[PDB]
């Protein structure tokens, strides 16, 4: 007795009320305390279809993790289209959490166990849970930060991987460190990245994009052009707004097994350029948010990158790829791709 | 015009008054409301020398502490010195909360603002606040739980390294989650703790260690022996008091950059067996309490390991280290070794 059905559901955290961090007074009003100890019931004999592209779980995230920065982060101005609103945009503390997305009583949410599904197609691995793994809502552009990784290989998962338009979601084995800091320019900032464990990735997973890919070239290119948001590795440290430089962290070439890189520095290590900037695009709404100048001291974030959003050209004998984003529900697909909320009925 | 002066200190609490956590019940009564924000009054071109292991606001704390648990947690019968002390031992609700310390008008806080600072010496660094930052008074020994971690490196603490005597404080950059239960034998409980999140952090601890250490074997071992209390990580979790064995935990040898461990299940967690008991060896004083049978249904303390507790042998290229703890003065320095009471006078 089981099914696909669309209901409401409700999220639980393992926030602190006494906490001023906006992710917690967020997350102690809109959300349950965890279980914290559910039970997954797991199942043999049974295969199930998933579609992390058609699911409405990252709809319900996408939309409460809108509400949450409507509270948390104001802007001082938000204009959208000729129309502009003032408000008070006091800095604030900031710092994700994880989330557990529950279903209502009467209906229960199916897990993936398969250890390398793409999370699109059938699974002859499957459980049930009423919560979700805790989800940090991180919001950011061509780097997924802070996310789970892939247990046992990478996984690649796009809705349609000979469409050039899709966006592909690489999901890492192993994270790479990466530090972004604003030392003591005021708008001036950067992020280090050590190119050795930057190199085994982009083999690893240009080797599993070689695998979808008869024999072609396979390069990874800087974002063509657009929007900073979009064409650089932009997020939220601190509730600062970074926007990250990264044509020399999308730049080399790796055909026949082999893996060539470019931009580095005598350490050893990739710096990236960023700009802490007051004016953005914002990812909630076509709309434009502008918040208040950059707060005092050093704004540094120690992150993980646990995974990558790409995107292929398509149209001789060479792929290319480029880093993408700006529909964050995919970042939210990458965590909620294992998911799937059925009905007991 | 700063100096080192002794001043009774007094607690600040985020505490609801409406709530029946004992911990609730004794902050509102003997705290006061938080700021809830003051400001640090940062400072440059100056330098002062701090010392974890002389500093009064912990021994303050020590006696708030032991207040609290005296009103808070009732033994069903308490026996000091032959004198046996009996009264209601009411099962009561029990989680800790943030406290912070504030200094009389007329006196200031030090803050030490480096990050890497051992707790003893020189701190060039510093700034000064009215109150401290939230800390959870969670007794207990060997692990530290529910603390604050080190932003950068892992820090290690002792009065005197070279002293095998003296208890050694670790403080982790990244904490490791551990969850100890007593499912629905009604005393027999455990705790599950992921291996490669252990195995990473007693790596990262070995490191540190072979640092104060030129060339030696480094290997980790239960406590040699004594009281449950001390040769266990013992705790409270909910009013219940586990005795969680960690033989398995601290159980690996560390040499020449590696690590090595020991003890593990299939699917790739390390378990401790627990016991919870009702006679018990007072932290607070030279006495034993005895408390009421353990609540029925689960127990369980979903808890993060934040720092250690450990004890060098002292005596040929071999530095054995054990789990200790058992003054809980100890794991009071290891959030107050960043602070130290100055007179403004
Ligand atoms: C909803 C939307 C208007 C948003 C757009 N993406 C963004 O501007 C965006 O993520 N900006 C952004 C990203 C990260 C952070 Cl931390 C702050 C701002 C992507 C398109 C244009 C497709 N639709
Ligand atoms: C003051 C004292 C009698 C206390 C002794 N340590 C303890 O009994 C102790 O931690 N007991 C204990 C610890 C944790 C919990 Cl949850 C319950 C009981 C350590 C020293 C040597 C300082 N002498
Ligand atoms: C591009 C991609 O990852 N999609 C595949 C899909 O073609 C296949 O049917 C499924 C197996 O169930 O695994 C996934
Ligand atoms: C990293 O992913 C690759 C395939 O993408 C896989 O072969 C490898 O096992 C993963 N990491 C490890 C465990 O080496
Ligand atoms: C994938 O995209 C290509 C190019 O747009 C399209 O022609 C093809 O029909 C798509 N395939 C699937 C799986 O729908
Ligand atoms: C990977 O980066 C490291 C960092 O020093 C470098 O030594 C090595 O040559 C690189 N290998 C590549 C680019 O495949
Ligand atoms: C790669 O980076 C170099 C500089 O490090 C730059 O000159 C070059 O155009 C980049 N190539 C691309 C766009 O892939
Ligand atoms: C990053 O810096 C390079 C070199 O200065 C520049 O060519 C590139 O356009 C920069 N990227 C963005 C989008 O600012
Ligand atoms: C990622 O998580 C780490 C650890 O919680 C945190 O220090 C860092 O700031 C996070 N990065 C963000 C905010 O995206
Ligand atoms: C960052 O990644 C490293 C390597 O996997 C890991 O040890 C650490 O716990 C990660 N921190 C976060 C942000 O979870
Ligand atoms: C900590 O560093 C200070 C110097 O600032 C030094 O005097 C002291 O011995 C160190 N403590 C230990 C034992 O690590
Ligand atoms: C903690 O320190 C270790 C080395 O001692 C380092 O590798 C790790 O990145 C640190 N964790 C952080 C900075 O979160
Ligand atoms: C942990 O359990 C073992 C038995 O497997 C026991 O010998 C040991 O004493 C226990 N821990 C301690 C040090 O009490
Ligand atoms: C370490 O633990 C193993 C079991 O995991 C046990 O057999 C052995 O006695 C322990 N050795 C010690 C306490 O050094
Ligand atoms: C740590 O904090 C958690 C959540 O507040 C709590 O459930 C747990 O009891 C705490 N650990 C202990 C045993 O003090």
Redesign the interface.
């Known amino acids: 007795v089981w099914k696909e059905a669309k209901t409401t559901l409700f999220c639980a955290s393992?926030a602190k009320?006494?906490?001023?961090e906006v992710h917690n007074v967020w997350a102690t009003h809109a959300c349950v305390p965890?279980d914290?100890?559910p039970q997954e019931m797991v199942l043999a004999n049974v295969t199930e279809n998933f579609n992390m592209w058609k699911n409405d779980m990252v709809e319900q995230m996408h939309e409460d993790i809108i509400s949450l920065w409507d509270e948390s982060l104001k802007p001082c101005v938000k204009l959208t289209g000729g129309s502009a609103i003032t408000q008070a945009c006091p800095k604030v503390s900031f710092d994700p959490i994880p989330l557990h997305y529950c279903a209502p009583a009467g209906f229960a949410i199916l897990k993936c166990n398969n250890k390398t599904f793409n999370g699109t197609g059938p699974c002859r691995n499957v459980s049930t849970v009423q919560c979700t793994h805790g989800i940090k809502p991180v919001v950011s552009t061509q780097l997924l930060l802070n996310g789970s990784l892939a247990e046992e290989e990478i996984i690649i998962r796009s809705e349609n991987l000979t469409n050039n338009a899709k966006t592909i979601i690489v999901h890492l084995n192993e994270s790479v460190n990466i530090v972004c800091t604003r030392p003591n320019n005021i708008r001036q900032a950067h992020c280090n990245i050590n190119e050795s464990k930057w190199n085994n990735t982009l083999q690893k997973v240009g080797e599993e994009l070689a695998k979808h890919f008869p024999s072609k070239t396979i390069k990874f290119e800087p974002s063509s052009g657009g929007d900073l948001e979009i064409t650089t590795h932009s997020f939220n440290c601190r509730g600062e707004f970074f926007y990250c430089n990264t044509s020399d962290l999308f730049n080399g070439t790796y055909r026949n097994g082999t893996y060539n890189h470019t931009g580095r520095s005598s350490n050893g290590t990739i710096t990236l350029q960023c700009k802490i900037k007051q004016i953005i695009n914002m990812w909630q709404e076509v709309g434009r948010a502008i918040y208040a100048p950059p707060i005092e001291?050093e704004i540094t974030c120690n992150s993980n990158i646990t995974g990558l959003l790409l995107l292929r050209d398509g149209g001789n004998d060479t792929e290319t790829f480029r880093p993408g984003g700006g529909d964050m529900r995919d970042n939210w697909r990458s965590e909620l791709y294992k998911y799937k909320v059925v009905e007991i009925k």
């Open positions: 393992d009320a006494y906490e001023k965890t914290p100890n001291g």
